[PDB]
Design a protein around this ligand. Structure first.
Ligand SMILES: *[C@@H]1O[C@H](C)[C@@H](NC(=O)[C@H](O)CO)[C@H](O)[C@H]1NC(C)=O
Ligand SMILES: *OP(=O)(O)OC[C@H](O)CO
Length: 161
């Protein structure tokens, strides 16, 4: 070989040392959102029992049978709230992933003639405790967990039935 080959080798070493990386932030966000999903999954029993024994969905954490929203917290979750039978979880505003800072995800259920189906996805709202339909959360806010930061199973629309 000669000097040109060595220079090319050094250039290739620099090229390899200055390479790019894929988007691992999405995977870390999914891993951190799994905790919020697990925390929100634990309030299903109380809401279901109240609905079965009273005929209407709970309107607040008080008669649902759970603690204050500010007390249901984890490493990356800061609040879990129940409103008209809908469970919503909010992530922390610091020491967490940048993409899922102060964002919300929701869980809700619909009653069938022989079963009760549960859904998971972007935030939804219910207007009346005796209603059977849901809609989108808001149009004047940006506190929605992106599709890229959710598992493929936890991607449901408000019109799903
Ligand atoms: C428990 O949640 C119920 C939905 C609520 N009931 C009503 O709001 C009435 O049906 C009028 O809509 C109860 O008042 C709640 N009980 C409490 C807060 O102690
Ligand atoms: O009242 P909740 O338990 O839903 O928590 C409220 C929180 O402090 C910010 O909305």
């Amino acid at each position: 070989f000669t000097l040109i080959e060595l220079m090319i080798v050094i250039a290739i070493v620099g090229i390899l040392a200055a390479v790019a990386l894929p988007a691992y932030q999405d995977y870390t966000a999914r891993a951190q959102v799994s905790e919020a999903i697990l925390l929100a999954e634990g309030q299903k029993s109380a809401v279901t029992e109240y609905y079965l024994n009273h005929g209407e969905w709970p309107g607040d954490n008080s008669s649902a049978g759970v603690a204050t929203s500010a007390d249901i917290k984890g490493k990356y979750v800061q609040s879990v709230t129940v409103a008209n039978g809908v469970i919503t979880a909010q992530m922390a505003s610091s020491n967490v992933n940048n993409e899922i800072k102060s964002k919300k995800l929701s869980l809700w259920a619909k009653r069938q003639n022989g079963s009760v189906k549960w859904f998971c996805g972007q935030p939804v709202t219910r207007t009346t405790a005796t209603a059977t339909d849901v809609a989108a959360a808001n149009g004047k806010t940006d506190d929605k967990i992106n599709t890229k930061h959710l598992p493929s199973t936890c991607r449901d629309d408000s019109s799903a039935s």
